[PDB]
């Protein structure tokens, strides 16, 4: 179960994939470093509450944009990590221009993902401030959190092969244990603020692997 | 433990105290009704940003609510002492008396919030650290009960001149019964409707706390 993710690390490190692996890993890192540069300088440019608050704003918008921009790039590698473990062994000849074709579909999928996320995200936040109910908000956030990991990454290979919007989810439901496992371990590793930059493509690798073996 | 609070409910209903009981009970009631009127009309004028102004007006409303209803509590607090003590039932205290407490209660309240806000903000930051959140609400429950103890038990202990720290120390000296009183009081605070009546019952119970210990 975390083995999918580990093998995803093995494949993400494959010499043939390294182009397609390092491609979104560089735009993601400059954005990660691009954060603290913009956060250090501009964020400085009652009150404590408001500051923690707007900080959270910044974090939310930052995350959301990071995902919507890295969305197509992940969908691309998804096909390629599939290729490697499948027919076209290791390095598969895919050109740059290819990326142009995935732009509409991947972005549609991503925005659909955020439209699934936000309302349940808002519901859990509101449960988080009902003085005696809060005791179960965080464990709900956590479970909803890792299921949100599952669909986020298991969506890439299952969109490359045409699938309905709900259908994917239903399949995600049709085997909840392994989904929750994969999303789970990918979440645990997601926590680490440094190694995660490499583990995010490791994620989509493991997820394409996940559909391949199922 | 909650019997001191219940006894407060008995005292808060005593025919002699009904003046001093119905003094803050009306200004708090009109502020409770005054909340939803202003929130019904003005809030529309104002989703994440929406939830933002929402929580903002909620907790800021409670803040101004405390700094406004602060003097009236201290006033009643002196009476429930008197009532259960020497001057039985109705104790003859006139309106102008209040004027003497306004400077002290406000200088005590902003100290409570000075105590509260940074610990409040300390827990909020704890509530967004991914795997650590699992214990943020339990802390918030404990911290929320201890925030009821020092809220009300501070009234009679401020009538009898005590330091801001010293009170806390005494509250620390007997943690269990403090957490008890503040505990039940918090549990009754949750009720959105009955709390308006149990808010004055609480301070009565707290003076009772200072008295019986």
Residue numbers in the entry:
A (entry chain B): 8 to 52, 72 to 240
B (entry chain A): 8 to 53, 74 to 240
Quote the study on this structure.
CysZ family members are 28–30 kDa bacterial inner-membrane proteins found exclusively in prokaryotes with no apparent homology to any of the established channel or transporter folds, and are scarcely studied in the literature. The CysZ protomer is an alpha-helical integral membrane protein with two long transmembrane (TM) helices (H2b and H3a) and two pairs of shorter helices (H4b-H5a and H7-H8) that insert only partially into the membrane (hemi-penetrating), forming a funnel or tripod-like shape within the membrane. The protein has an extra-membranous hydrophilic ‘head’, comprising an iris-like arrangement of the two short helices, H1 and H6, and kinked helices H3b, H4a, and H5b. Besides not resembling other transporter structures, CysZ mediates sulfate flux into cells or proteoliposomes without coupling to ion gradients, partner proteins, or exogenous energy sources such as ATP.
The structure of PfCysZ was solved second, to 3.5 Å resolution, with crystals also belonging to space group C2. Although PfCysZ and IlCysZ share 42% sequence identity, molecular replacement failed to find a convincing solution, and we instead used SeMet-derivatized PfCysZ to obtain phase information by multi-crystal SeMet SAD. Unlike PdCysZ, both IlCysZ and PfCysZ crystallize as dimers, in agreement with their different behavior in detergent-containing solution. The PfCysZ dimer is also arranged in an antiparallel orientation but with a different dimer interface. In the PfCysZ structure, helices H4b-H5a together form a narrower angle with helices H2 and H3, and tuck-in closer to the rest of the molecule. The resulting dumbbell-shaped PfCysZ dimer is predicted, by OPM/PPM (Orientation of Proteins in Membranes), to lie in the membrane at a 31° tilt to the perpendicular, in agreement with the position of its central hydrophobic belt, as revealed by surface-electrostatics calculations. On the other hand, the PfCysZ dimer resembles the transverse pair of protomers lying at a tilt, just as was predicted by OPM, along the side of the PdCysZ hexamer when viewed from inside the plane of the membrane. Disulfide-trapping experiments of the transverse dimer, performed by crosslinking a pair of mutants (L161C-A164C) on helix H5 of PfCysZ, as well as the corresponding pair in IlCysZ (V157C-Q163C) confirm the dimer interface observed in the structures of PfCysZ and IlCysZ, and, as a consequence, the antiparallel assembly of the two proteins. The ‘transverse’ dimer structure of PfCysZ clarified the possibility for ion permeation by showing that openings in its two protomers aligned across the putative membrane; however, the prospective transduction pathway would then be open on one side to the bilayer. In the case of IlCysZ and PfCysZ, this assembly may have come apart into the subsequently crystallized dimeric components during the process of detergent extraction from the membrane and purification.
